[PDB]
Amino acid sequence: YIGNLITRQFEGRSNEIVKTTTKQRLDAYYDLELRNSVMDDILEMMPESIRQKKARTILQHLSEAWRCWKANIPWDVPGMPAPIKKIIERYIKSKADAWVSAAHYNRERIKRGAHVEKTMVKKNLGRLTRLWIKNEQERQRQIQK
């Protein structure tokens, strides 16, 4: 304990501090890996001549479409290339499975009563009411069809 303290006095803090993933920065790190994976797959599809500008705009459609899936609004872009639209719909459903299964897993925690954070109760409250109304809107369309 003191041997780290004294060497911090004499030598200073190391500049190579690498933050481990933690409960507080898991949701951010899940997004950094997700934007990288979508960026890599779309950039291979591109025949040629794609730069830091065109890779910057395409990652918007991903962010917009995740909002549309949360809204249960169908996400259709006119003039969108069908391979890229095939890619973006895939990663949303990847993210949808993590979004839904984390919502199930935390409800089982809350019913047991075993150490759920005060913010996490409100987040799980918000995740379910998306899922319940989404299940409601699916059932309305099946009756209509």
Binding site: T7, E11, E16
Partner: protein, 39 residues
């Protein structure tokens, strides 16, 4: 602005040329010091 995505990740090329510190971490203490070999 001031809230941005990443264009590239932090590379390990930069931390390799730094001088080390040699701070002693709790998880780098000696543990499981013997390897097991398969038959």
């Amino acid at each position: 602005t001031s809230h941005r995505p990443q264009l590239e990740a932090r590379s390990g090329a930069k931390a390799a040329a730094y001088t080390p510190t040699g701070i002693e971490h709790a998880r780098l203490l000696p543990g499981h010091t013997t390897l097991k070999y398969r038959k």
